[PDB]
Amino acid sequence: SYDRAITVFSPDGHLFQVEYAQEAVKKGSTAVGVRGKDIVVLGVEKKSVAKLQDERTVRKICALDDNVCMAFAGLTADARIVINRARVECQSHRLTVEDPVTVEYITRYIASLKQRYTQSNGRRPFGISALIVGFDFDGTPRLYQTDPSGTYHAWKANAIGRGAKSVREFLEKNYTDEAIETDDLTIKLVIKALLEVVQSGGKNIELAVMRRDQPLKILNPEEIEKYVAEI
Amino acid sequence: SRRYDSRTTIFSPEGRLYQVEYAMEAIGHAGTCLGILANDGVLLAAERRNIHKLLDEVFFSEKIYKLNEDMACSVAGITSDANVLTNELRLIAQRYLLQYQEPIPCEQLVTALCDIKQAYTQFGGKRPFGVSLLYIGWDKHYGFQLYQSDPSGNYGGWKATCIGNNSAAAVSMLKQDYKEGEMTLKSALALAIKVLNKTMDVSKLSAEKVEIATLTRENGKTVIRVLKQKEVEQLIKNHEEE
Amino acid sequence: SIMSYNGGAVMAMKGKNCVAIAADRRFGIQAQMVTTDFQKIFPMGDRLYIGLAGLATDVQTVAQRLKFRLNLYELKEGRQIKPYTLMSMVANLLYEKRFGPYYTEPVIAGLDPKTFKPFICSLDLIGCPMVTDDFVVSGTCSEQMYGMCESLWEPNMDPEHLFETISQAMLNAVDRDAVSGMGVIVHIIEKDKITTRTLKARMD
Amino acid sequence: NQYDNDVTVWSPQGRIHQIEYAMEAVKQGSATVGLKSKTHAVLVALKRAQSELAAHQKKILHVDNHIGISIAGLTADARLLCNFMRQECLDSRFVFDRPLPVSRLVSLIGSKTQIPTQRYGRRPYGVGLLIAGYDDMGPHIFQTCPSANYFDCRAMSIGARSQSARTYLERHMSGFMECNLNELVKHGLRALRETLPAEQDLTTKNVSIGIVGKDLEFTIYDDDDVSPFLEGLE
Amino acid sequence: GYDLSASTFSPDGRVFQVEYAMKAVENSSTAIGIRCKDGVVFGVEKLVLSKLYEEGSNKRLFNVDRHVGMAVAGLLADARSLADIAREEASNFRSNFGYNIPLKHLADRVAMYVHAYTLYSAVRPFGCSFMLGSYSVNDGAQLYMIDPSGVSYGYWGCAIGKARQAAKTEIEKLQMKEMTCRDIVKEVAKIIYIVHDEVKDKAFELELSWVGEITKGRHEIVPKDIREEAEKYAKESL
Amino acid sequence: GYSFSLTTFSPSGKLVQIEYALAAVAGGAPSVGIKAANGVVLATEKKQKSILYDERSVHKVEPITKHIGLVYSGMGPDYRVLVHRARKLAQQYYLVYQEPIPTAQLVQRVASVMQEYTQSGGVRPFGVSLLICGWNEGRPYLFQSDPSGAYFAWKATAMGKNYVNGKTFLEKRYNEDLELEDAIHTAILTLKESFEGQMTEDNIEVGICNEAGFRRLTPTEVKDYL
Amino acid sequence: TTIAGLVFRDGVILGADTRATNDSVVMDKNCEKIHFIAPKIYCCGAGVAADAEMTTRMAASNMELHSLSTGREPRVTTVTRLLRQTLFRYRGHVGASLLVGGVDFSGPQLYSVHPHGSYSRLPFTALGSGQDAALAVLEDRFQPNMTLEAAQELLVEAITAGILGDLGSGGSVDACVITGTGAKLLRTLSSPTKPTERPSQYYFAPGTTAVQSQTVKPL
Amino acid sequence: GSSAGFDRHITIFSPEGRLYQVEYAFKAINQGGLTSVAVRGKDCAVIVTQKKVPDKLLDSSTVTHLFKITENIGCVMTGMTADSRSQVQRARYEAANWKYKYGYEIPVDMLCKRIADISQVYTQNAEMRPLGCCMILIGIDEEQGPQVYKCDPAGYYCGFKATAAGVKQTESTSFLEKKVKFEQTVETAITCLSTVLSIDFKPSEIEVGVVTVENPKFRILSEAEIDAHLVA
Amino acid sequence: TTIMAVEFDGGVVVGSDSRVSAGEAVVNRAFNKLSPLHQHIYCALSGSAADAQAMADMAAYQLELHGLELEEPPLVLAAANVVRNISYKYREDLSAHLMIAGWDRRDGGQVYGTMGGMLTRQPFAIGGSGSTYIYGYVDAAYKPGMSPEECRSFTTNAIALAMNRDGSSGGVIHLVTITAAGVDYQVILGNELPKFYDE
């Protein structure tokens, strides 16, 4: 069995492997999450959109449970593994506590799994960052973000992947209480925030929202097109 | 021993995995495979590289493997690696059938092999599988389907794709000619020959240098079948006329 | 006894360039009947069938596990399995659980994939094959089946005569067995065709 | 350069750099003295303090009723070894219903710490030890090293500038056997104070004492309890 | 770097790592073993690095069995573990066959264990050389020596340490075959005092142990009175 | 043992360790296989360094089962390991199916053992190529398994030293209709094309496979053929 | 089951009946009980049919590997040792009663192997349920160094006694003759029993059985 | 002489397909400074070796390169002493195990092959190095007669009429070559060693192990037995 | 089964019957219960055939290796210790007594009883199911200083008396005399067996 230490400390207390994993997240397609009043919206860029590719197979916005979904950035293959782990954990929690897991609880689990991979023998860190949204039993909307190191915070509006900083700068100066007043407005914010980086605005963005109680919904090309015309 | 370790599953300073990238270089040099999905079926068409006159023919095909009753795949890159993966897909499909008493849906099969491929990239210290696959299948959820996976353990559904030598060229040629929803197996097969005539630098295509499986439905039964040389010859003939 | 827990009878008969396989259709727990169309004979090729009698749960498990192995075997080697090879595969599968065996006595009936030569055999619970040139029986009413086969079976019977022989053997044999009955399914395996028939039988 | 990274790599001079680097850890530690008379065995250590608001680090640990130790070097390793020693002593009392002879316990330590100095990937224990005990062969003062070697001594000193204490120890060791408890503790203190800077002096804050004798279980004296021994020093 | 691992042969077919371990035994005190007419005598020039150390500390003479003694040179920690290995062997042999292990067999077994640490990069070769001596009525007197490589040979007289090249010539000029334990104890002591360096490597103690007819086959430290005489005859005759 | 791969991809996408294992094969002594209509021949140079080597002691052409035989080019002691493994694989197959393992199923299993030493921890590939011949389902079979674990079915091929010249010679001389007895002649002639001096019936070894089974020609028989 | 063996002047002769039964019902009227171990070594099996079958196949497979690697004829002693070491391992749970007979470099050898792992090298033996009848014949007529034909006759009579005296045995008599030269596997050396010539008769026509449903699938 | 990566430190293939580490292990055999010679006769097999005891205090009886594997199998080791002893012990274990599971004494060719198989593993596994020794086995086969086999560090083994190992391996082979193209066999062997060493050693300078058809049991000649062949 | 071994100045005399039984049926009437573990060391098997044969083979293998390692004929005590260890280690699984008799150059001819893992050296030893009937006879007939010829007679008589009384014993008497010179076998057939009161 391979027991070599891959993630180790450097002279100035830096974990090179973890920073290299963060570099992989920077080359990932932009993903934006906005926490609205009664809704949660996720928006990922489609980067190179070919005309011969089945759109439904490369979605970067998956569902972990009825109330929890997530968007990622970085290594797609790595993301799949993490998503499956989370899904299994969600069913385990639902079976031992007889209740839907809270957004923060599953966020905590994924973050913990990522940290475990930065201090274990024979493995490298996961090369992805995730945006976790959803609603808890009481009805309050949640938005979390985990990274390769294993750290996680709760946000109002965040952006990961290539151009995360650019989108973050625009989100700060555009996120207010009069920007998430209505469901439509909240979605427009994410679309407008995604238009700051994603080239050829229109069908280059993958959007999906999660309204209170109902299952995850995915906006269609023409449904997103209409929103773009209003902006 | 740290001294001799090659360090296969660690990131580079730009967040790249070199072994995976170099496994991919292998593939771009393998024989060309192309997949086209039609309304009435799906097909694979592969350049043969086993060409020497003293090769015996004894086998179904060089690079096209049947995975279960409803799917096949063709492979590009390290042949002996492909043998490991193709045997594993057969095992995965039979595991599913044993458990659910139903054929494995095509995307579930692809995903489960790709999990095996991603694990080699992340832990264990071994080199990755130097293989890309194209998979063709029919299932009751999505019907006719075509997938591609690569040594990173990444996969994606396609209408038409190509891997191996001169894939980039094949793709731009498929982007010009592939008609979404308007494609028939006859049309698909024609396009295959067109794309294969251009990705192969032997001018005359030759029905000895290619391998073509088609996958169709007849009476609620999937039918996978390697085209015989006559049919391919005719197919080639038909391209010459154009 | 565990073998009579669900009941059931299976028999295979050899004819002139043709094989016949029949079985009862009753699925019951002890004295209570649950269904009257439980599958006991499974296809293992165009002209190859396996009949399984014994514990219903093991009948289904063995059939499914054998299919798993046969499918993989037929993907690896690019050909249809031979009747004799299938027998060994089943024997090996049954012998693996030597000290915790599957409660099922299988009977195989078919024709060689390339030569179309009739072949029938039976194996015990632990996997001891027994190839015969006349007939093989298995189930709760094996004794009754032996009597019928021993006196009714003739050499070189044609498809029609073979059908009548195995039908009469099974029908009269299951009528003296309380846990076997509720219909009879017969499969006639020939070079170019397979004929499946359900006989008019007692439903008590 | 190519020989001082692994413990399993013999250098061309016939040395093992990694074991030598692990011995440097004991030399950087705070000094501690160990001496014995005819009926007693005492340990005296200088407690170090990270800052003025910090408590002085523990340096004298309990092993058993007849055995006590003084550490120098990596504290984590010292606690590791201590645990091992405690278990061995407990095992001896469970099986044979008698205290484990100090000499036998020292040999177990030697063997345990020797293993890691021959296996690839492993490292030597980075802690030096001073062991005081009392069994059927009288009082003992043992000194364990990071390279699995141990010496039976009349008096010993390890840690930063322990050579000065050793020099003092050698000069006054002739009257140790006939020394009494109070007298024997003074010598240790005097030798322990020799490794200290001209300005600094031994007080009831940076001094810890541990004694074990004929009719006395291994006890440790801290701060206010070390006043009596401290009162009288010239 | 051809000399970094024991599982790597150099271009001229040498295993440098094992040779480096032999260098560690080369820069150490000298121990001697002499096979007389009815026994074996061991003598070590124990170097007292400090005056604080108790008389009899860091013993380089061990009892691996009732009838077997061991004299070592080199890394004491490595030597100590080898002594425990030797003890294990002897004990295991008695439990399996019901009698005292023959010296030759014991030496062969321990040598193979030593040889096992000279083929891989996972472990390093032992940094010590030792001698095995024993006496029985059915075997007579036997003396063997094992080094870091694992080679085991039987001897009449042997020396290990920094002054083994000089001690061998001193052992050469002796008629040990017709000598006895009682008479060889004075010669061993004398020889040790001769090879011992005055200026360099100052302050040493003399360790003496024997096994033979005089001790009725049991290996033990030479008696104080006899050692006194031997040391008195060593200093007076030097 | 080392748990990491010793064979890994280069930036050009090559696995040099396997390229280097192939260099070992190509410097090996020559080997030839020919599949005739009614059989296969395997033939190899077993020139010994001296005349002290008891030539009859060790055999490069080896049976696996009644119906399968092997020869190799490259590293003799690596060949030994493979021979033993093929023999165990053929037995394992026979114990399950109670029919002797088809040649192509033996080739796949052995080739698979070869691929594992291109990826498993701490080991180097095999410095050997195999030619395997067999007779099953009234058809003769000849295969080559290389160090990468790839296999190919041949009508005729040559390997070891001077294989490229050898193949060109077999292009020109092989035909499908060719009977065994003739096949044997052109086997022995392909060897002659690269042989040093004076091919005796003790410094080549020859095995044949047909309906009757696989066997090593006896030196007495090789002599007749010479 | 009645199996027997005997060492004659130029080799060994094995014999067995061909009846396989389930408790008290004849399942197989012609099962082969003389299994091939090697070219000059055969084995008769008694006890649990599945065990005997799997054990001999395993022994034959292992002997083949050994013969292939050594390149020499397998010894009979290697076979018996392989068998007893395996059987002893399972502590009699593998019910295999074997009679190994063969001719190797050291000559003709005959062994009786029991389920627990014990073995016996003898000039003549017998195992199975009809083992006492066959032994009776042997004790009464066995002579050392018998001629090939005289041995066959004796073995046939020994097996015959078991066939007629033991309810567990019946059918035909199989024999196996092994010498330095060749091996003669005489499946059905004698057929001492057969059924009647059928006094009456009963047959069915092409519609005597009432059919509920039919399904024909052309191939 | 191409080289890349770590192909000279561990047993991996170099650019030309060579195994440098294994080649270095052959150079380790000559480090002992000895030469061995084994000669197969018509009804016997003899093994002669250079017995050098340059130390005086060394017990000459414990110094030998000839070992008894089984009752009928003897051998001579050449190369690294410690490695040789471990290989001798392995051979003895293999032989005893063979008889225990097969019921008959292991043939010399099978024993040599078994030791060679074990040596092959070292050339394929990088974690451990090959042994720096050479094994030569002699024994009487019941069907083939006298046998002489030798395996090396590369895992290669073969049957021989006469073969040598050590520092003067190339010279012993050239001397035995002309001879092939009891008493004479023993003489030829001794001659070959003496010829390439130019010393004409006395009875206590060499060791002799033999196995004849009449006396199959491995035997070691004494001082008086060795001198007798030296006087003639 | 009846087995016996007697010590004499210069060696030992080992003997046994040849009956292998399965209930009331004699499965082997000419079985040799004396097995050689080494050149000068023999063992008499009693109890379970499979167990005795398994242990004897195991001991022979172990002793063979031991002998070659030490380059000297093994001691009789070593052989007994090897058997004792196996018999003691598997005392709950095995059911057979391997009597040990032989000769070495250290302690001459020795007889050891290793039944159930317990080891004891005796002047003479008897085991097996038929040994119970001859306990009184051997106690009254054995005399110290018996010669080899007298030991064989003593052994023969004792075994013959047991064979006639015990249903599990019978057939012929296998005899073995071990001494420095070597091992000399002897078989006493049914017609040449000592006759006593059989009425």
Short mmCIF file of C-alpha atoms in Angstrom, two decimals, chain E:
data_model
loop_
_atom_site.label_atom_id
_atom_site.label_comp_id
_atom_site.label_asym_id
_atom_site.label_seq_id
_atom_site.Cartn_x
_atom_site.Cartn_y
_atom_site.Cartn_z
CA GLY E 1 25.23 7.65 -5.20
CA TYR E 2 26.16 3.97 -5.32
CA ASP E 3 26.80 3.89 -1.57
CA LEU E 4 23.38 5.04 -0.36
CA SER E 5 21.54 1.73 -0.10
CA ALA E 6 22.29 -1.90 0.77
CA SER E 7 20.12 -3.11 -2.13
CA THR E 8 22.38 -1.34 -4.63
CA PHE E 9 25.57 -2.83 -6.02
CA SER E 10 28.29 -0.47 -7.17
CA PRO E 11 29.93 -0.75 -10.63
CA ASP E 12 32.79 -2.93 -9.27
CA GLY E 13 30.35 -5.27 -7.47
CA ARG E 14 30.70 -3.87 -3.95
CA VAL E 15 28.06 -3.13 -1.32
CA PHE E 16 29.42 0.09 0.17
CA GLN E 17 26.69 0.40 2.82
CA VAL E 18 27.84 -2.84 4.47
CA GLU E 19 31.44 -1.62 4.25
CA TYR E 20 30.52 1.64 5.98
CA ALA E 21 29.05 -0.37 8.85
CA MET E 22 32.37 -2.22 9.11
CA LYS E 23 34.06 1.18 9.45
CA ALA E 24 31.95 1.79 12.57
CA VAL E 25 33.36 -1.39 14.12
CA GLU E 26 36.84 -0.36 13.00
CA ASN E 27 36.73 2.85 15.03
CA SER E 28 35.90 1.13 18.31
CA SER E 29 37.58 -0.52 21.30
CA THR E 30 39.34 -3.85 20.79
CA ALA E 31 37.96 -7.14 22.11
CA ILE E 32 39.80 -10.48 22.02
CA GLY E 33 38.84 -14.14 21.97
CA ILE E 34 41.23 -17.03 22.51
CA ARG E 35 40.45 -20.72 22.11
CA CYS E 36 42.59 -22.73 24.53
CA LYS E 37 42.88 -26.46 25.16
CA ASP E 38 39.83 -26.57 27.43
CA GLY E 39 37.88 -23.32 27.00
CA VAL E 40 37.50 -19.80 25.64
CA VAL E 41 38.59 -16.47 27.12
CA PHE E 42 37.16 -13.06 26.26
CA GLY E 43 38.85 -9.73 26.96
CA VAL E 44 37.65 -6.23 26.12
CA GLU E 45 39.42 -2.89 26.41
CA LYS E 46 36.42 -1.02 27.80
CA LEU E 47 36.96 2.69 27.22
CA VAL E 48 35.76 4.83 30.13
CA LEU E 49 34.68 8.10 28.52
CA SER E 50 33.65 9.60 31.87
CA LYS E 51 34.58 9.26 35.53
CA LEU E 52 30.91 9.59 36.48
CA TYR E 53 30.08 6.21 34.95
CA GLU E 54 29.83 3.36 37.44
CA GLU E 55 32.44 0.60 37.47
CA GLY E 56 30.91 -2.02 35.19
CA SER E 57 28.82 0.25 32.98
CA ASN E 58 28.33 -0.35 29.24
CA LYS E 59 29.42 -3.98 29.47
CA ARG E 60 30.62 -5.35 26.14
CA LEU E 61 30.52 -8.95 27.36
CA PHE E 62 27.14 -10.67 27.43
CA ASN E 63 25.75 -14.06 28.39
CA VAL E 64 23.55 -15.16 25.49
CA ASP E 65 23.11 -18.62 27.01
CA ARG E 66 24.22 -20.74 29.95
CA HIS E 67 27.15 -22.15 27.96
CA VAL E 68 27.61 -19.23 25.54
CA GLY E 69 29.32 -15.85 25.94
CA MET E 70 29.39 -12.88 23.55
CA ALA E 71 32.03 -10.17 23.07
CA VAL E 72 31.11 -7.24 20.84
CA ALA E 73 32.65 -4.22 19.11
CA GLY E 74 31.06 -1.21 17.41
CA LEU E 75 27.66 0.42 18.01
CA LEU E 76 26.65 -0.77 21.48
CA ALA E 77 22.93 -0.36 20.73
CA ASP E 78 23.24 -2.54 17.63
CA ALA E 79 25.36 -5.04 19.54
CA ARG E 80 22.82 -5.15 22.37
CA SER E 81 19.94 -6.01 20.04
CA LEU E 82 22.08 -8.71 18.40
CA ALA E 83 22.74 -10.18 21.85
CA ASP E 84 18.98 -10.34 22.44
CA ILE E 85 18.57 -11.99 19.04
CA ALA E 86 21.24 -14.53 19.98
CA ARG E 87 19.50 -15.19 23.29
CA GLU E 88 16.20 -15.73 21.48
CA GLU E 89 17.84 -18.26 19.17
CA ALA E 90 19.40 -20.28 21.99
CA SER E 91 16.13 -20.27 23.94
CA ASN E 92 14.09 -21.26 20.86
CA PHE E 93 16.47 -24.13 20.09
CA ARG E 94 16.13 -25.62 23.57
CA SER E 95 12.34 -25.41 23.39
CA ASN E 96 12.31 -27.17 20.01
CA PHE E 97 14.93 -29.91 20.47
CA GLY E 98 15.34 -30.22 24.25
CA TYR E 99 19.03 -29.42 24.70
CA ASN E 100 21.73 -26.73 24.61
CA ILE E 101 22.25 -25.27 21.15
CA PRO E 102 25.60 -26.14 19.55
CA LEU E 103 27.79 -23.04 19.19
CA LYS E 104 28.29 -23.52 15.44
CA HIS E 105 24.53 -23.71 14.87
CA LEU E 106 23.89 -20.65 17.05
CA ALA E 107 26.55 -18.70 15.17
CA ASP E 108 25.13 -19.73 11.79
CA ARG E 109 21.61 -18.68 12.80
CA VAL E 110 22.62 -15.26 14.15
CA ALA E 111 24.84 -14.65 11.12
CA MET E 112 21.89 -15.27 8.79
CA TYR E 113 19.83 -12.75 10.77
CA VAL E 114 22.71 -10.29 10.42
CA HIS E 115 22.96 -11.09 6.69
CA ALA E 116 19.26 -10.23 6.29
CA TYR E 117 19.91 -6.52 6.96
CA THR E 118 22.36 -6.23 4.05
CA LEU E 119 20.09 -6.75 1.04
CA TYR E 120 17.50 -3.97 1.28
CA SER E 121 17.07 -0.21 1.32
CA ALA E 122 14.31 -0.59 3.94
CA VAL E 123 16.85 -1.39 6.65
CA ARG E 124 20.53 -0.75 7.32
CA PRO E 125 23.33 -3.22 8.10
CA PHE E 126 24.24 -3.79 11.76
CA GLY E 127 27.10 -1.59 12.92
CA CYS E 128 28.81 -4.17 15.10
CA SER E 129 31.03 -7.24 15.10
CA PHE E 130 30.86 -9.88 17.83
CA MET E 131 32.42 -13.11 19.05
CA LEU E 132 30.73 -16.27 20.32
CA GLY E 133 32.48 -18.61 22.74
CA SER E 134 31.29 -21.76 24.50
CA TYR E 135 32.42 -25.07 25.96
CA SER E 136 30.88 -28.51 26.36
CA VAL E 137 32.27 -32.01 26.90
CA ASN E 138 30.71 -33.28 23.66
CA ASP E 139 31.86 -30.29 21.60
CA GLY E 140 35.03 -29.08 23.29
CA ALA E 141 35.93 -25.40 22.95
CA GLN E 142 34.46 -23.35 20.10
CA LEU E 143 34.99 -19.73 19.07
CA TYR E 144 33.25 -17.86 16.25
CA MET E 145 33.14 -14.30 14.93
CA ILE E 146 30.43 -12.50 12.94
CA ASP E 147 30.74 -9.15 11.19
CA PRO E 148 28.30 -6.67 9.55
CA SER E 149 28.24 -8.59 6.24
CA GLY E 150 27.08 -11.77 7.93
CA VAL E 151 30.13 -13.95 7.39
CA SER E 152 30.73 -16.41 10.22
CA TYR E 153 34.05 -18.18 10.82
CA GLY E 154 35.50 -20.40 13.54
CA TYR E 155 38.75 -19.28 15.16
CA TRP E 156 41.57 -20.23 17.52
CA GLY E 157 42.31 -16.61 18.36
CA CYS E 158 40.41 -13.52 17.23
CA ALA E 159 40.47 -9.74 17.58
CA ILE E 160 37.92 -7.04 16.78
CA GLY E 161 38.17 -3.27 17.11
CA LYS E 162 40.54 -0.46 16.15
CA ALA E 163 43.65 -2.37 17.22
CA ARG E 164 42.86 -5.78 15.75
CA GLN E 165 45.74 -5.72 13.25
CA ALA E 166 48.23 -5.34 16.10
CA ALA E 167 46.47 -7.67 18.53
CA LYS E 168 46.46 -10.49 15.98
CA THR E 169 50.26 -10.54 15.80
CA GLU E 170 50.39 -10.66 19.59
CA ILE E 171 47.88 -13.51 19.61
CA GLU E 172 49.87 -15.18 16.85
CA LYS E 173 52.88 -15.61 19.15
CA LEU E 174 51.19 -17.97 21.61
CA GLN E 175 50.60 -21.72 21.90
CA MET E 176 46.88 -21.60 22.73
CA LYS E 177 46.22 -25.18 21.54
CA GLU E 178 48.13 -26.63 24.51
CA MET E 179 47.21 -23.78 26.88
CA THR E 180 44.41 -23.67 29.44
CA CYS E 181 41.82 -21.11 30.56
CA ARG E 182 43.80 -20.42 33.75
CA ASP E 183 46.95 -19.61 31.78
CA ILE E 184 45.27 -17.85 28.85
CA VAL E 185 43.61 -15.31 31.15
CA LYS E 186 46.98 -13.70 31.89
CA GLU E 187 47.97 -13.63 28.21
CA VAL E 188 44.66 -12.12 27.15
CA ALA E 189 45.00 -9.43 29.80
CA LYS E 190 48.62 -8.86 28.77
CA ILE E 191 47.72 -8.59 25.08
CA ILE E 192 44.90 -6.12 25.75
CA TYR E 193 47.23 -3.87 27.72
CA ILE E 194 49.76 -3.94 24.88
CA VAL E 195 47.47 -2.85 22.05
CA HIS E 196 45.76 -0.24 24.22
CA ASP E 197 46.81 3.29 23.27
CA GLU E 198 48.06 5.59 26.04
CA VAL E 199 47.82 9.17 24.75
CA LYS E 200 44.88 8.62 22.41
CA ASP E 201 41.81 6.84 23.80
CA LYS E 202 42.89 7.35 27.42
CA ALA E 203 41.23 5.67 30.46
CA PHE E 204 40.17 2.06 29.98
CA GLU E 205 38.93 -0.85 32.07
CA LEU E 206 39.61 -4.56 31.53
CA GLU E 207 36.64 -6.86 31.02
CA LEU E 208 37.27 -10.59 31.32
CA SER E 209 34.96 -13.57 30.88
CA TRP E 210 35.52 -17.26 30.23
CA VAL E 211 33.82 -20.58 29.54
CA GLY E 212 35.41 -24.01 29.73
CA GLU E 213 36.35 -26.89 32.01
CA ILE E 214 37.35 -24.53 34.83
CA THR E 215 33.87 -22.99 34.91
CA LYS E 216 32.23 -26.37 34.22
CA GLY E 217 30.89 -25.25 30.84
CA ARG E 218 29.15 -22.14 32.14
CA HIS E 219 30.10 -18.78 30.65
CA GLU E 220 30.86 -16.21 33.34
CA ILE E 221 32.96 -13.18 34.23
CA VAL E 222 36.48 -14.12 35.30
CA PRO E 223 36.77 -14.03 39.14
CA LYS E 224 38.14 -10.87 40.79
CA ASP E 225 41.12 -12.70 42.29
CA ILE E 226 42.11 -14.33 39.00
CA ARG E 227 41.49 -11.07 37.13
CA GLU E 228 43.61 -9.25 39.69
CA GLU E 229 46.52 -11.61 39.05
CA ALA E 230 46.03 -11.35 35.30
CA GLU E 231 46.02 -7.55 35.41
CA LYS E 232 48.93 -7.59 37.84
CA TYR E 233 50.87 -9.84 35.46
CA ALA E 234 49.84 -7.66 32.52
CA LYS E 235 51.10 -4.35 33.90
CA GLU E 236 54.24 -5.88 35.40
CA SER E 237 55.01 -7.55 32.07
CA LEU E 238 54.71 -4.57 29.72
#
